[PDB]
Structures are given as C-alpha cells and as structure tokens.
Paper text:
Norovirus (NoV) is a positive-sense single-stranded RNA (+RNA) virus belonging to the Caliciviridae family. Moreover, the crystal structure of the complex provided the evidence that the interaction between VPg and RdRp plays a crucial role in NoV replication through the higher-order multimer formation of RdRp molecules.
Continuous electron density was observed at the base of the palm domain of RdRp in the initial map. Two helix backbones (α1 and α2) modeled for VPg were fitted to the electron density with lower B factor, which was verified by examining a simulated annealing composite omit map at the 1.2σ level. MNV VPg had a distinct helix-loop-helix conformation and bound to the palm domain of RdRp, and the binding site was relatively similar to that of EV71 RdRp but far from that of VPg at the active site of FMDV or the thumb domain of CV RdRps. The electron density for the oligo(A)8 RNA was not visible in the complex structure, despite the presence of the oligonucleotide in the crystallization solution. A large ball-like hexameric arrangement of RdRp was observed in the crystal structures. A face-to-face contact of the palm domains was capable of forming a dimeric structure, and the trimer interface was largely made up of the thumb and fingers domains in the hexameric complex. The crystal structure of the MNV RdRp-VPg(1-73) complex showed a more tightly packed arrangement of RdRp molecules than that of RdRp molecules themselves; a hexamer of RdRp molecules was surrounded compactly by six neighboring hexamers and this was mediated by specific binding of VPg(1-73). Further, the interactions between RdRp molecules in the RdRp-VPg(1-73) complex were distinct from that of the native; interactions between Arg329 and Gln389 and between Asp91 and Arg411 of adjacent RdRp molecules were observed in the RdRp-VPg(1-73) complex structure but absent in the native.
Numbering used by the authors:
A (entry chain B): 263 to 435, 441 to 491
B (entry chain E): 8 to 436, 439 to 492
C (entry chain C): 263 to 436, 439 to 473, 476 to 491
Amino acid sequence: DIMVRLSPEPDLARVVMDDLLAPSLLDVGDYKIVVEEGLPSGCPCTTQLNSLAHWILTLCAMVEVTRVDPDIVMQESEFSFYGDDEVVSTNLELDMVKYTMALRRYGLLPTRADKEEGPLERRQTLQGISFLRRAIVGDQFGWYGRLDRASIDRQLLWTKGPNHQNPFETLPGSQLMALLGEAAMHGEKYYRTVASRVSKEAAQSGIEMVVPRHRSVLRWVRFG
Amino acid sequence: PSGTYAGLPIADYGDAPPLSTKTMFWRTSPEKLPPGAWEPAYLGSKDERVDGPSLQQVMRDQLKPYSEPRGLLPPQEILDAVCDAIENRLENTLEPQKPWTFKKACESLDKNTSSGYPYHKQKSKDWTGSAFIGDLGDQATHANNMYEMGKSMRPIYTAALKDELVKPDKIYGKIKKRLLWGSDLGTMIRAARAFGPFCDALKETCIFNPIRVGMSMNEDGPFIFARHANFRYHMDADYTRWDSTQQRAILKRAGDIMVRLSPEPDLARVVMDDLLAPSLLDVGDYKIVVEEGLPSGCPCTTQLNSLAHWILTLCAMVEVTRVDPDIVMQESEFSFYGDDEVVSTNLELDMVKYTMALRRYGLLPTRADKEEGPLERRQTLQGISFLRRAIVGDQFGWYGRLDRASIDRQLLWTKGPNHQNPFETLPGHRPSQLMALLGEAAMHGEKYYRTVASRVSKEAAQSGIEMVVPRHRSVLRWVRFGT
Amino acid sequence: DIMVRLSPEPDLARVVMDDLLAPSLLDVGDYKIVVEEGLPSGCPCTTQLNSLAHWILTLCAMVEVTRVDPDIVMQESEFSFYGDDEVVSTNLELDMVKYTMALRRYGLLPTRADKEEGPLERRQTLQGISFLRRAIVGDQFGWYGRLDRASIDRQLLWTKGPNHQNPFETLPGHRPSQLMALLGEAAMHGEKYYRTVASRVSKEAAQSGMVVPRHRSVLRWVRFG
C-alpha cells in the first residue's frame, strides 16, 4: 500500500500489487499449489518490498517496547535493511528481553550468534556486526565493510562456469583482482597468502597477472 | 578389537606397563604428621593408608572428561584477526633461528623419563652422551629419517598417573590422581626437530611476550610483575580441567602459528598434523582414540598450550570489547604458563559477559571463593598467584614469594627413590634444595626465617653434615638482588 | 659520610673523602685558586657522589613539602638519578609550588621546559620525559629509551677525529660500528626515519670503502636481541 501510494500510477500499481499479494500459485513441477502466506520472492521489486516489511516489523517492535511514537524512535535511530539482513543502531534503552519476545510473537525467528535460547544481544559499538556477508570495521581512515576470510578462500577454491555434473572437474578455461582487494583489508599476512595462491594459480592457466603491493591495492579499494 | 573404554573408542590392544604403585616422596623425620597435612597421592591396592579403587578406575575417572561434548568455537572473524595479530607480534619479537640437527634434538630431551612406546625404557639406558644407540637408537634414526622425508607417523601416547602431594581429601576421601600423557621417543624427536628453534626463540623473549615458559622467577619475575603493575585491572581465571576442555581447532590455530614461525615450515607442518590428529592413548589394557582435548606429552606441548590460552583469552576480550586485538595487546599485559595466567588490562571489561564467553568456549573458570558467578577483577596486582607463587611488592619492587604452606610441605617431604611406604625416613643426603627453601622463607620476615632456620639446623644436625645458616639480611639480599 | 661508612676500608676512605671535599685547589693556568664551594667534578666517583647529593636534596624537598616521613616517600616513589639528570615518579599529591620553592631555597636552579618562570610541571604519564639525553617511550612491547633525532643527525654530520683548527675540514679517513649503532638508534623512530638514515649512511658509505638491514630486523635486535 505504501509502494502504491508513492507510485506515479497508483491505480495500475494497485491492481498489480493486489495480484502479487493474492494467494500465489507455485509450480513445484508436478502440481501448481496455492501458497496463502509467506513472501513470493520472485518479482523484481520483491527486495524493496521485503525491506519495507522488515522496516515495518522492526519499528513496530520498538514502539511495542518503548511505547513511544515511531517518529521518536526513528529520529533516535538508524536502520539498515536489505531483505532479511538488518543492522539497527539506536540511542533508546531497549529491553532486549521484551524486544525478542515481541519479535518471536510476530512469527519471526531471531537467533543469537551462539544459537542458544535467550534474549538478543545489544552492543555499544558497531564493530564486528555483519552486513551483506561483510564485517563492519573501523580505523583511522574511517569505517568499511570487509568480506570474511572464508568467502575469500572459497572463491579461491571455486570458479563459476558452464553447467556440469561432477563439481570436482577442473575448468580448462577479473575475479582474482577483486579477491586480492577484499583480502587486502585483512592485513599484509593474509594478503601475502592470497597473493601466493593467485600467483600460483594464474601461472597454471590463461595469462600472467601483476600482483600488486598490499599498500597500493589497499589504497585502491579503500579510497579509489 | 572394538568397544568403548571410559566413553572413548577402542583402537587396539595395550602394550603399556602397569601403573606405578610407588612414590618418590620420603619423610624427613619420624614425627607424626600435623593434622590436615598433605601426603603423596594414592598408590594403588598396595597402599596401606586407605582401601581405595584400582588405579585403572582412577585413570578411568580422569579420562571421563575427554569424552564430554566440546564448547562453542569463537566467531571466525575474531579468531582469524587474533591469530594474525599474535603471529605478527611473534614475527616482530622472535629472532629467526637455524634448523635443529638430529644431535641437538637428541640432546634436548630429558634422559630420566620413559622412552614411551614401544620400549618404556629410561632414555638414559641407551644414551652415550652424544647420540642414541640400541633399540632407542634405531627408534631415533627411523623417526629422524621420516622427519627428513616429510612423511607422517602416528604418535602413540602412554597414559600414567602423577605422583605428587595432594590434599588429604584426595587420599582418605574421594580418591583422585592427575592424568599424565607420556610421548614416544620418535614423536619426541620429531617435535623437537620441528619446534625447538621456535620454543628457544620464544624463551629468549620470555620477558617481552606473554608466553612465560622458561623464565626464572627470582631474576626475571620482578620485571614481569612491574610490567603487569603498569596497568589498572588484574585478574586470574584459575581454570579447572584446562587440558580436558580444550578444542582441537584452537590447538590447530596455535600449531599453525608455531609452524609458520619455524625455520622448516614444511616438516613442522607434517609433525603438527601428526600431533593434533586423533591421539592414540595407551591405558594399559587397550589403546584408545582421544579425538579432543590436549595431548600433554610432547616437549613443545607447554608452548602450544600457552599459545592456545593466549588465543582464547584475546578472543574473549575482543568478543566483549569489540576493539581490535592489537589495541587490546597494547592496552594489556598477559602472562601465560600453560593453564596458568595473569591478565592485566586497562579496558573496562564486563566480567559477566567475559565469564559467559569463557564458559561458552568450553573452559571452566573458578572464582576464588569457589562459588558460581562472574570472575573477580581487582585494582591491584597484590594477591594474584602465578607459578605457585604469590605476587608481592614493596619499596624495592615486585617479586614472587612461595607460600608458607608449600615451605612447610617441602620441609616435611623430600624427593628420593621410589618406595611403597611414604612415611619411611630417608637416610640419604637435600643440601641444595634446603638453601633454596631458606631463601624462599627469608621473604616472609625474620620470625619465619628463624623458625625455618631452626628446623633446617635440627634436620641437618640429626643427619649427615651441616651448613651455616646465614643472616636474614644477607640471604634476603641474595635472593632479591642477584649476587 | 654515607659513601665512607659503606666502604670496606672506612678509616682509609675517610682521609681521602676529607681531602676531596676540603677547599679545592683549581689550576686555571695562571694561578692555583681556592674553590670553597661547588662540586669538584674530576674524581672517578664524582658522579656517584653527585648523584647521592641529588638524592638527598630531592628527598628533603618532598618531606619538607609533604610532611610525611622520607622512607614512606621512598616506598611510594621511584627515583632515577644520574648526576644532575633525574626522573622522579611518585604517587603523593605534590604541591609543585612548594616543591620548587624548597628547591630554589636550597640554591638549586630548576627550570621549566618552556623557559618560563613559575612552578615545575608534573604530568600523569611517564611518556616524553627525558633521561640521559634520551626520551622515555612505551609501546605494546614495553618501555624503552630512544635517542632524540637531532643528536642522530648531528652524529651523521660530525665525526670524531684528531685535533685540528678548522671545524669545517672534511675528514679524509675512511666508521663501521659508529654507523651501525646510529642505524640502531634511528630504527627506534620508525621505518620513515630509518629509511632516511639508511639512505644517508649508504651515501656516506659510497664516498668510502656495509649491509643495511631491513627496519624490522635491526629494530628487534636493538629492542630485544
């Protein structure tokens, strides 16, 4: 309804949204079944819609805990929503017990990092939080998001290509420089490791590639 | 052979010898023990002090914790960052070393301990003063050739029980005897050649790095404690079952650090992979498979354990404070000797969440009052314990002082050959240990020094020769300030 | 008196100290004059003696200011004395006004770093204070004393040799250990200054007839080694 009211052609978007949010027909191959609830995550705009829903739910929980009007929360808070992914920063003293209780009451499934039962954790610093598979870090140059180490090693182990049946087939056929950049934000040690791996790899395939110094590629990815 | 021994899988049959029923501790005088005094641990079915279980049952009781579910692993980003920080600090601190020869690795071993599998022979029985010969010589040569070839060998550990003075409740009440891991000569030599350079280079910087393995309390102690006292808050977690509760992944990170700093990294990688693989412990009846815990048999096991302790502590502090590990490391001073720690820091640490993260990692920290709850944090270094010493400070500086009870114990008990009745009086020599005891007693004042001096004079005037009991001030100056 | 009473032959040392502290005969070339006061800084022990005097004076001022006993001062404080050079660390709440007043009353001439009149400055951190012409610095590895930059550049500009008249004459002689020690002292200032000093040393070695290590190796050698 928000998206329609904010659209330049509200009646046509109203019809399209009513069609989108009606009980959906999912084709599982054998039959077409009717899914009445959940999110139909197929449409191109589904990410914005999902993010707006996340925003609504979060604000609702905070108004249920603080009992103050949503504008008060929203002027005292900064939200970041990408579908199911969130980062919530706020100045209000939030009772995390009741916050988690209200979240679980809505049907949601919030989880602690230790995967144990109990209330959600709130920290006094943004460092360490994860967003878009990256960790939020800060230094004398400012804040940044750095891809975790597992994803870098993983993309060093696997490359994308045409569809095949045995995942352990080696492909006899860019991304390496992006991996080098993402590894530069982890220090000179990990950069040296990744640089050795890429140098050994690219000398077994295609063409040679310059392996920059840590400081140069770090400068390029941080301050472009 | 299949089955389950003490909750742990069975792999093969046991070639280990029977558990020792003797003790090395002798009484110094035929007088009656004071009530509540300490006595050597339970000695088996032949122990005439109590009727207790078999030593096999006590070893089973000590092996039960190794079957227990592990704790949670720290967050991966924190772990990677802290391991990189530790490795970088060691690179900045450690002096590069030259690879160890077979001769140097063979001369580094203690020849008064068992060779382990398969001979269980005292190393000195096949020692020439230069290299190994005989059975132990062939074992050593095979281990060395496999080391040079970069080929893997699986270590076979031998289980034993520790002979030591324990509180009487551990003898006349619920009987307990600490579990010891002995290693085989081949694995000893492999680990020596691999990590001798690293351990020695770490020992040369026992003052500037928290791994305090190899330090001398009387010479290097005061500096360590002044460095600690430069900081605001001080704590000691005093973990219970440190080795049983360790996770092999943390030990693998520590071993990666130890290998990356070694002069022969490819060979040390193979040796560490062999050390940290599922361990084969020989409990006498069977050879069982211990998949987790710490195999505390190898010569480098102390450095490895200390590094793991460092990793875990830093991880917990970074998980609570969310500040970078190097920032912690310049705002903190650690002292680690295996399971023993002293942590000094300026950061305002939420001891509740700190203890929560520690218990989440599988560790078992205990309060001083032995009651459950959060860890204690103090604003002074005074009272903290490290290497069985108490940290004290005065106008001359800081120092480590042996407790009074330990002094009384060493006055009551002396080490000698293995016997069956701990209350037998030793007719033999301790002319050197006694002077050290006099020095340790001097740090308690002239009264306690007079008492200890009376006891020493009485003990040496009823036996052998004698010695001149120096003035309090002279021996105090001698033990405090190097002479 | 302290130094004599602690010597193994106190009666023999007494006469020598009485001779040392008596009105001194200073030879200024034309005459031998009588210096009744001051410190005769010629004897081998003159530094220790001076330092002991420094100790006394410092302690006196503090007990005159704090009104607490000197042994309590000394167990609640840490002193460092090298003749006229000192570093005083203490936990006592010290009125720097009365401290400087008592020092100037004793004939001493304490000076601020900014060369302005007023009481002495006390800081809550040991970092930055100077002792033996070196600065006290601390890092994640511990504390250390590092020679200032000006002295390093000066020793790069000036070298010791035989006595001559024109200070701007260039010495034609071809210094190993001196330059290596200078490289070490420059290493404790960071890789930037170490690179500059290393370039200067190499350039000064291309006019004569060593291995210039990486910063980290020499840094570890001079810090821990």
